Write a protein that binds this ligand. Structure first.
Ligand SMILES: CO[C@@H]1O[C@H](CO)[C@@H](O)[C@H](O)[C@@H]1O
Ligand SMILES: [Fe+3]
Ligand SMILES: [Zn+2]
Ligand SMILES: [Zn+2]
Length: 341
């Protein structure tokens, strides 16, 4: 029984963590850092215990000895009778999204266009699309493919940050945290929605959750699913209803990681925390909901049903899968066995 120290990325996550801390009676406390990489370092030092990470960061964390503990699980069809916490995760679909009005724009004509990315090093926003582009062009100059982009985490003076906007005051341009207007799934989709970019690399869920009244955010309230198309690898364009036949890859779900020596303790505390503040928790929506933050995906994705046990006690490599690990390794050769910190 000790507290678990969660690592929040940026000021907005910090605020949500503080609410969680208060409601949990200090069983969970908060450490804050400006980037995901800095949070990983805090965990390695033992100054923080855990945080929830996209697959691209699990790769970084894994090389440094951190392990997956529990995974985000969202609504599913198969394995219907089984409880959420025990149900296998299905993974999400990485897609490339454009405006219907941008006619004749296909996977094969993306060169020199404007792109919107969740963040550098993330699965749907970066690793998958850039990995595919590097291959198809046979060049490590992915910094040269698009004319301008917003890829949070890149050099703020480079073309890869040209479209990023910063915070209400125009500060923190291109920072890889929610202070940057176009950061993350929602941010990259907004970058496309506002016609700042020509293409957004996000997941299939992002399109649905931010269209047809699903989001009441000022920029999203008038967005219609029909005004968007997905780019398929075969050069065609399809409606967003066809994601199962028109995606770039299937990605492993975001997951909670911790130091191996702390895994058992983190797992215990989190399972109890979700019984109190999760999907149908004792205190949600009454007092506090761990999986809500108004489409902002703070700490956890808003569409998370529960955190699920893994099973087979997988290493980070088995969790990510050989097909994804080799993809990252090859892309990493552009810009092999050691912790990068
Ligand atoms: C997509 O499923 C994954 O496949 C890889 C094989 O690369 C395994 O290591 C892992 O446990 C999972 O079953
Ligand atoms: Fe992701
Ligand atoms: Zn597929
Ligand atoms: Zn194993």
């Amino acid at each position: 029984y000790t507290r678990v120290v969660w690592c929040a990325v940026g000021p907005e996550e910090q605020k949500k963590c503080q609410q969680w801390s208060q409601q949990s009676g200090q069983n969970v406390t908060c450490a804050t850092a400006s980037t995901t990489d800095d949070c990983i370092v805090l965990v390695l030092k033992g100054e923080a215990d855990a945080l929830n990470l996209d697959g691209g960061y699990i790769y970084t964390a894994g090389k440094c000895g951190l392990v997956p503990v529990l995974a985000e699980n969202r609504k599913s069809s198969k394995h219907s009778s089984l409880d959420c916490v025990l149900r296998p995760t299905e993974g999400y679909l990485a897609v490339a999204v454009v405006k219907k009005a941008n006619e004749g724009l296909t996977w094969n004509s993306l060169k020199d266009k404007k792109s919107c990315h969740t963040a550098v090093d993330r699965t749907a926003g970066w690793n998958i699309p850039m990995g595919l582009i590097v291959n198809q062009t046979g060049s490590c100059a992915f910094d040269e493919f698009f004319s301008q982009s917003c890829a949070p985490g890149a050099d703020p003076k480079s073309r890869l940050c040209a479209l990023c906007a910063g915070d209400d005051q125009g500060l923190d341009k291109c920072v890889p945290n929610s202070k940057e207007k176009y950061y993350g799934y929602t941010g990259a989709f907004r970058c496309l929605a506002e016609d700042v970019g020509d293409v957004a690399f996000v997941k299939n869920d992002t399109v649905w959750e931010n269209t047809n009244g699903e989001s009441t955010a000022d920029w999203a309230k008038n967005l219609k699913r029909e005004d968007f198309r997905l780019l398929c690898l075969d050069g065609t364009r399809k409606p967003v209803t066809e994601a199962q036949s028109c995606h770039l890859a299937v990605a492993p779900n975001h997951a909670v990681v911790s130091r191996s020596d702390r895994a058992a303790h983190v797992e215990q505390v989190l399972l109890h925390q979700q019984a109190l503040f999760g999907k149908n928790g004792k205190n949600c929506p009454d007092k506090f909901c761990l999986f809500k933050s108004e489409t902002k995906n703070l700490l956890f994705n808003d569409n998370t049903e529960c955190l699920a046990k893994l099973g087979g006690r997988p290493t980070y490599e088995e969790y990510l899968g050989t097909e994804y690990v080799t993809a990252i390794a090859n892309l990493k050769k552009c810009s092999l066995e050691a912790c990068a910190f």
